[PDB]
């Protein structure tokens, strides 16, 4: 109820450190090998997760309830806006703490307000298992069909989302019916590949004078080069801007 910007959903993060097993067992090489170094390694990992997770969630008023944390396990239920905006924060702070050599995978799920927590946790655990099945670092946005690498998600999806949010704000009457027709074409293009690309070019030059001279050609470029990213960018755009 404090959120008054997006869709009334509850977003769920489950994360775990991948490849933690052989790194914890035999990670430090045999030449410069110490026992207290391993003690600092594991004690610093648990230390990081506990105190930096509480401080990173305290410094900005994130509407996130942490259930439990740890290296092996992480489970947080909150508003989906803060969960999505905090997953990149947690990934980058883990990369800074571990000097970006311990990988991390995660799974973001999104559920309605009154949903059972047991089925919630099982579904999001399934999502993050599908993320770690890719066998590298990745994340699933809301579904097992949308698996993205962390740099891919962060860079591609968030620059496309920020560009879309800059462009459709200054437009006075374009959204959101144009965006729904655009998503209809960009998900029909998976099966009927040619005619939806033709309809896409037709609509973009149709609304060249309306949505912008350069944004329409940018959408036409993005919808051929890195397509599947832009569908998720538009979907989370509407999920953010729904009143």
């Amino acid at each position: 109820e404090e959120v008054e910007v997006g869709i009334n959903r509850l977003g769920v993060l489950r994360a775990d450190v991948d490849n933690l097993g052989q790194a914890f067992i035999n990670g430090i090489p045999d030449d410069y090998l110490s026992i207290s170094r391993t003690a600092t390694f594991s004690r610093a990992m648990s230390r990081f997760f506990k105190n930096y997770l509480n401080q990173l969630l305290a410094e900005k008023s994130y509407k996130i309830n942490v259930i439990y944390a740890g290296g092996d396990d992480l489970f947080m239920i909150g508003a989906w806006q803060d969960i999505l905006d905090f997953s990149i924060v947690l990934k980058q702070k883990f990369a800074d703490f571990t000097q970006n050599k311990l990988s991390i995978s995660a799974g973001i799920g999104m559920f309605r307000e009154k949903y059972p927590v047991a089925r919630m946790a099982s579904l999001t655990g399934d999502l993050e298992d599908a993320a770690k099945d890719y066998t590298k670092n990745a994340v699933t946005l809301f579904d097992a069909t949308n698996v993205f690498s962390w740099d891919t998600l962060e860079n591609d999806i968030f620059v496309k989302l920020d560009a879309i949010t800059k462009n459709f704000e200054k437009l006075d009457e374009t959204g959101k019916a144009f965006i729904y027709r655009l998503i209809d074409l960009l998900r029909g293009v998976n099966e009927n590949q040619q005619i939806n690309i033709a309809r896409l070019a037709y609509t973009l030059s149709r609304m060249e004078e309306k949505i912008g001279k350069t944004f329409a050609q940018e959408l036409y470029n993005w919808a051929n080069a890195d397509r599947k990213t832009l569908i998720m960018a538009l979907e989370i755009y509407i999920l953010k801007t729904r009143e």
């Binding site: 009927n192 590949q193 040619q194 005619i195 690309i197 033709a198 309809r199 070019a201 037709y202 973009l204 030059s205 149709r206 060249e208 004078e209």
Partner: protein, 139 residues
Amino acid sequence: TELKIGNEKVNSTNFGDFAEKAIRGINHKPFVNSKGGEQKITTSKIRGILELVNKVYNRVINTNDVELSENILADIAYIKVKIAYESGREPVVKDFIQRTAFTAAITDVMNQRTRESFLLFARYVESLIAYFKFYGGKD
């Protein structure tokens, strides 16, 4: 399920690509109307061609059998008559029809008298109109 144009066949993997190549070949070498300057076909004539296709396309998509009925094929043959008429009127229409090869497509639709062949032709013409508006639009 595979429509023949010239020496290279077009199907439901290439008609957007073939129509894009045809439109972008209409530009970079346009038609000359026996005077000094070039002249390309305008929006209204190709929308006439698309309307002629759509007058059958509005009926074919709600049909049952995989082979077209005879009144559909009657209207397809009459589309062929209309395109041959309007191309003989203005030579800029004849250039667009021959280069973005239309008559061969509609004849080979009339040979294999199936629903999927006509849908392939209709999406081909729809992509052709789409790429004409995409390249160098005057709206």
